[PDB]
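Q: For a teaching session next week I want to show students how multiple molecules come together into a single three-dimensional assembly. I've collected the sequence lines for a complex. Could you give me the predicted structure tokens for the whole thing so I can convert them for display?
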Amino acid sequence: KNHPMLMNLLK
Amino acid sequence: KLSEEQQHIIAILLDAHHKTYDPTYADFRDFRPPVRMSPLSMLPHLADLVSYSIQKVIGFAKMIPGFRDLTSDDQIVLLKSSAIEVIMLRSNQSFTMDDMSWDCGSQDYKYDVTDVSKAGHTLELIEPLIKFQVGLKKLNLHEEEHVLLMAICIVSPDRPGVQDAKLVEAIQDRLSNTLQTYIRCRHPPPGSHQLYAKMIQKLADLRSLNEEHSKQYRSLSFQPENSMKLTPLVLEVFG
Ligand SMILES: C=C1[C@H](O)CC(=C/C=C2\CCC[C@]3(C)[C@@H]([C@H](C)CCC[C@H](OC)c4ccc(O)cc4)CC[C@@H]23)C[C@H]1O
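A: Of course. Below is the structure for the complete assembly, covering every listed component.
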């Protein structure tokens, strides 16, 4: 995906 | 008519919104300062504002009943595509028809057509956006209706890239039906007249705003020196 910040804020 | 599941949904969404929307706007002090006095003078400040607002829309989205049963990939796609639209919808709370501005509590933080223009935008976006704000504000939504519309906007099954669309639809359908029923039981006429339909129309108006925004983004984006003024989150989410 290459969406680390958004992944992180969603967890 | 409004079941216990539906009252629970509404109570979760009101509280989630309250946890993610500070009507004092205290955190605005942490943003790069606005500059009014210069074509892209407001860009750092509004980039920062947008970036924070993405963060708060994510915090709201996470709390949507059902959202967490979605896969990460689906969570991601729904947020990427809806973020600007939810920011637009949530901005209605600061929007005032008095002078067609978003008034975040002090003159520093009161934004108008010229402030937005000085962030790299034209009337191609701004005119239909202020029209949206006006037409949304005239609906006079209950806060319950407001939060349901934002949630319905995020859990949209037609966003491209969506894998488990059917799951997205079952979630969204639970919130549409809660909204339908809420209006029936709690929204007295005449304000309730065609109110669901008028709300669904606003989600259509947001698709067109999103489109235009993505286009202006691409243009600004193409200039590495302006793209420099954004934030890493905004670059990640808006591409
Ligand atoms: C907390 C609040 C308050 O209600 C204040 C708030 C206001 C929102 C506004 C009023 C100011 C202008 C806003 C932010 C709109 C514009 C189009 C966003 C411009 C900034 C954006 O930077 C990421 C951008 C994108 C492309 C560009 O070429 C130049 C700038 C989108 C919605 C507009 C958002 C909400 O989250």
